[PDB]
Design a protein around this ligand. Structure first.
Ligand SMILES: *C(#N)C1([N]C(=O)[C]2[C][C][C][C][C]2C(=O)N2[C][C]C3=C([C]2)C2=C([C]=[C]C(F)=[C]2)[N]3)[C][C]1
Length: 215
């Protein structure tokens, strides 16, 4: 694996979105990983529909939370996910309005990264593309992050409450990091991104629930 990777530089990453008040981070994370694999497979980058997931992944709880693995399985069994344009985001739950004419990507299942293994997560990011991950995003320090490599010893790897997208990894001023795309808008963090401590004992649980879709 290369010493550093950044898929944003390779056109695998769509603009930062804003989930708003709805608890649909799992949908945005899922969409981002799907977006990356679509670009890799077909050469086209497009916005896929988190709302399709919120509304249609029946076992998840819409704006009340969910798992990315269930999202990927839906896209597989559904034989599609719509584009954002075909099924735009409204940030509240509603009945399922999936339309196959709006389909922009398919899924052949998913793979999970071994729990807690940041070495495995690095290798996956390097080999595959952006990877969906869950973290503890509950600390004030995370909420108001602006710059640098994020670390707070109060971060609880057993409190996975937020889904984000690992789009790369690297080092800054001698401290290794993951490059993380959030879905709290471009005004959050550093233009919507946060660098999170890497190889510091799985800080914030970053490798505890990582997965990516097969395409
Ligand atoms: C976002 N926004 C929020 N966080 C989540 O959805 C996280 C994403 C990372 C994995 C855990 C998930 C979470 O907080 N859970 C609790 C709420 C919930 C989950 C998982 C879940 C529900 C229903 C079905 C299911 F399969 C999983 N509810 C703030 C939502």
């Amino acid at each position: 694996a290369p010493d550093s990777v950044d898929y944003r530089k390779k056109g695998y990453v769509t603009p930062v979105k804003n989930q708003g008040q709805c608890g649909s981070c799992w949908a945005f994370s899922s969409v981002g990983a799907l977006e990356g694999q679509l670009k890799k497979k077909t050469g086209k980058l497009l916005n896929l529909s988190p709302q399709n997931l919120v509304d249609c992944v029946s076992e998840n709880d819409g704006c009340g939370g969910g798992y990315m693995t269930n999202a990927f399985q839906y896209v597989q069994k559904n034989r599609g996910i719509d584009s954002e344009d075909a099924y735009p985001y409204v940030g509240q739950e509603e009945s399922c309005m999936y339309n196959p004419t709006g389909k922009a990507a398919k899924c052949r299942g998913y793979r999970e990264i071994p729990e807690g293994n940041e070495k495995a997560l690095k290798r996956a990011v390097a080999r595959v593309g952006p990877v969906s991950v869950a973290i503890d995003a509950s600390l004030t320090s995370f909420q108001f992050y602006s710059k640098g490599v994020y670390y707070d010893e109060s971060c609880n790897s057993d409190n996975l409450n937020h889904a984000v997208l690992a789009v790369g990894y690297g080092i800054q001023k001698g401290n290794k990091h993951w490059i993380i795309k959030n879905s709290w808008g471009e005004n959050w963090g550093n233009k919507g991104y946060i660098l999170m401590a890497r190889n510091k004992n799985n800080a914030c649980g970053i490798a505890n629930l990582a997965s990516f879709p097969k395409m």
